[PDB]
Write a protein that binds this DNA or RNA. Sequence first.
RNA 1: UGACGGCUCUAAUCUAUUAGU
DNA 2: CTAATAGATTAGAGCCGTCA
Lengths: 469, 100
Amino acid sequence: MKELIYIEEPKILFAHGQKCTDARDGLALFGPLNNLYGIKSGVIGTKQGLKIFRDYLDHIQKPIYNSNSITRPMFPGFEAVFDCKWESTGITFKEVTNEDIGKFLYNSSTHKRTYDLVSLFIDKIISANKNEDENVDVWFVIVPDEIYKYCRPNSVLPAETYNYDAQFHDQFKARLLKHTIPTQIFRESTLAWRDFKNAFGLPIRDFSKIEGHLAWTISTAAFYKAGGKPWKLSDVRNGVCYLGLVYKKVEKSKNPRNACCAAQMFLDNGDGTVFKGEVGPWYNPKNGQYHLEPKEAKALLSQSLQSYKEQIGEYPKEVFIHAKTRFNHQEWDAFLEVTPKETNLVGVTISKTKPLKLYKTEGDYTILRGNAYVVNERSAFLWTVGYVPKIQTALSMEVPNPLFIEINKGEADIKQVLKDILSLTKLNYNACIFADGEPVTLRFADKIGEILTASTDIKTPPLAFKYYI
Amino acid sequence: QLSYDDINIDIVRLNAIDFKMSWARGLKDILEAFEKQKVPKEVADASKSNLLYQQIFLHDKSVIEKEEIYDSNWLSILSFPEELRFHEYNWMLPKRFDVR
RNA sequence: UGACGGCUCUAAUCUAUUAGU
DNA sequence: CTAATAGATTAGAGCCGTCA
Ligand SMILES: [Mg+2]
């Protein structure tokens, strides 16, 4: 008969200085934080892509409802929420003839055709950027379904260009980093799901009951990619820096050459949540080893500390290094050798390969979210997925599987660690959801590491997320 | 920032609805009071005014303190033998016997 | 690549023993 | 160093559901 402890929801902040718990309700009651004036858009694609994009933009100017208004709060229209103008008047079409797209996608070599498609698109986008007086904020790339399907490494067709990826998305996002154009990739079947069907007269992607959720997430992503700040945290304390750390294999290379990346979150003393990547890919030449060398470990820690210091002027009082791996001793000693005296380094391992499933005795509903089972002073379980009593449902479908959290190195309180981890799940600007199942410091670092791995021609890449997500 | 004393004397004795900590539970109290005191609401928009009325009164839902008991998929081992033994078959078993 | 969750299938790398060193 | 026995520990890819 072990005991469970429950942790309250952290709450997120909005305009008027108003704190709520759900992002959707807090965008439809007080609106976003910063004040833009409108989003001018660029569209690259075929004529049908412009048609579909115009249709969707015109559609989402009116309120959209869902089937269930408790589980999924309504969408009251784009301008009624975001206090800005985004219609089919500030568009700038760049027609791409279907002849070239069809001609390229028949070469039977995935890398070659991926390279050709990415070059074809980015040449037009860069030419539009540099040599014209038009100001366009978010470049929307409408891509046909067949291009998306046939752009995988394990795809089938029914040396100079081999140092790349086989994916349209990763190469496209990597090759435009040095020019910094915020782009958004759409599929044709996503914006117009009615037309794209199967041999049954019904759409393949059925959004009939969840149109409002699709509008919410698309509008939120567009608002964030255009210099918008929709919400921020509420009670993340001063003097604390949160760091992520993820390892990515570079795959196509002579050496195994594991790479590593990071993310940084903290408070800027102006109540703003500074949140950006701190990445210059550090490489481990050893196969299968997921540990930094002392040199690169020192370099990474020094870069993070210097960024924090130049941001605020004072070194952090507490530092948290989150990861999915376990540090060895040399890595942590290298960490410690370049650390100031008035600063605490704490490392945490967040794992998901640990089977512990709890079942309610009577009902047909799963366990509450905030429940946590403390094992030791340095080990616990946390349920980031579970029943939320405000939306009358859960975040998953089957019985969920909790995160296993251990304080690997340092001295701290496990309750505060779980509280901060739960608070770090309300920052998924890529989505509009109640909360995340894993902390955001470990998911955006993953996206950065996946983006800046397909290319090897990149130096000093930017830190803002708007060019990766 | 203003205390009880500084309140206008003509209004301090009246029941007041509080917006200090949020504007949403204050609106919940407003709707409760209005529907209790029979204010003439003329619903002109259907399926919209009701949904907005429902969005408040549910944003503030939370958990209740009731004892709960859960099962799991862990079975606790009860008993163990008292001796782990290392027997010594010095070249007394085949070198490639495949003990398993 | 509009999100998220749950599964399944695959390579790796360490640590302890044994024979080819 | 390479060939097997395990326990413990990380990544990469692909598929399906979301409703009432
Ligand atoms: Mg995105």
